[PDB]
Symmetry: C3
Subunit: 150 residues, 3 copies
């Protein structure tokens, strides 16, 4: 009967997989985007960098950190849909000119708009992504769309 | 051997936890922008868009525009429309053949809840369908903006 | 061969646990809070008590019912985030001066602001929670943030 149980439990698990897959699609509409094993989700409102960063970390994730063209495109979809530029997780607060992820690791991908980053004004240590997907270093005190990744 | 037995017993415990946890999250997830009816789930985006844009949003999300195929589904959909107090677009149109409304697949309707006198192709240019807060349907110009509600 | 059958099932279950865990974080961000086996979720808008109560009940849950300091703090987080006081499920509509849960039992926990409840104007049978986490009885006809528990 052990084989029978495995047969039965697998039926329940595959039914669970089906239900879960459906609820996942529902979950991401319309404020989320999945790319690979990563999920981006916007809070739907704007906040300064520090507050946005805290919201994501307290939620068990971190600010959007596109590490490839594919991830950047998925994130771009949310920014376009909300029509609001969003903050990324990277900053060059430690070493001006050198942007890093929250862990301190150097960028493995970038999509800077022409002429960026320019540390305009002498104090732009955060990064925002435009509706066109391009990046721009921006003053961390400005308010931008909050998008976290999980 | 008994090793497999122990593993099956372990799997049963993990599965029961997932089922209970998932049962709770289903309710949490659908509050307040979703409605479950049978094996279908309606989810509103909370904003309005013209038909073509609304349709694209749903298809890109892995679903399609709300397609109520029974009174029960139509009532579930109506709940979201009433909550947002915004009439919504359905997926059906008679863009191909005037007077013949079909689902995106091309199949003819299996259920309808037209308000009296509808569809009337008003102005000779209404190929889309909207559902009112009272649950009744009305054919409407696809260029108009209505609440976006997808089904999954 | 049963071993290879169980082995396949184990793979599915382990993947589901990981996928479900990631999804839980996505769902709770930014309108939910999990504390113990309870989950609070705000609709993000305000409604009078009766309408708020119906929304929660029809959703398969009930209005926020903090039963401990831990739960109250979790609920408070949502109130603070939305900067809108929220209705709790308890009322003393049946017997003035005696607040009870929807079931009818008396409170097992409370966090009343100084001087409350005071049945102001002789007509406050509902309860709101402030951004400071304290409670105040309020007219059920007033509109407050809708927060349900599941
Ligand atoms: O964050 C500020 C922006 O980088 C802005 O800076 C300068 O004013 C110019 O280089 C603009 O073209 C650029 O868009
Ligand atoms: O979509 C437009 C509606 O059909 C509208 O059209 C006309 O104006 C009349 O027939 C109305 O009674 C009807 O409600
Ligand atoms: O809900 C109404 C509040 O209790 C309010 O009532 C009265 O106006 C006074 O007792 C205030 O100090 C108190 O804050
Ligand atoms: Ca600097
Ligand atoms: Ca800088
Ligand atoms: Ca710049
Ligand atoms: Ca036509
Ligand atoms: Ca028509
Ligand atoms: Ca019409
Ligand atoms: Ca009273
Ligand atoms: Ca009272
Ligand atoms: Ca009071």
């Amino acid at each position: 009967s052990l084989r029978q149980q495995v047969e039965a439990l697998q039926g329940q698990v595959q039914h669970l997989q089906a239900a879960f897959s459906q609820y996942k699609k529902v979950e991401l509409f319309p404020n989320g985007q999945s790319v690979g094993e990563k999920i981006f989700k916007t809070a739907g409102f704007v906040k300064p960098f520090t507050e946005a960063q805290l919201l994501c970390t307290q939620a068990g994730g971190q600010l959007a950190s596109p590490r490839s063209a594919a991830e950047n495109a998925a994130l771009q979809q949310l920014v376009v849909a909300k029509n609001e530029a969003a903050f990324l997780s990277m900053t060059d607060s430690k070493t001006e000119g050198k942007f890093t992820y929250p862990t301190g690791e150097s960028l493995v991908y970038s999509n800077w708009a022409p002429g960026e980053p320019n540390d305009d004004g002498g104090s732009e240590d955060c990064v925002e992504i435009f509706t066109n997907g391009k990046w721009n270093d921006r003053a961390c005190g400005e308010k931008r769309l909050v998008v976290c990744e999980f």
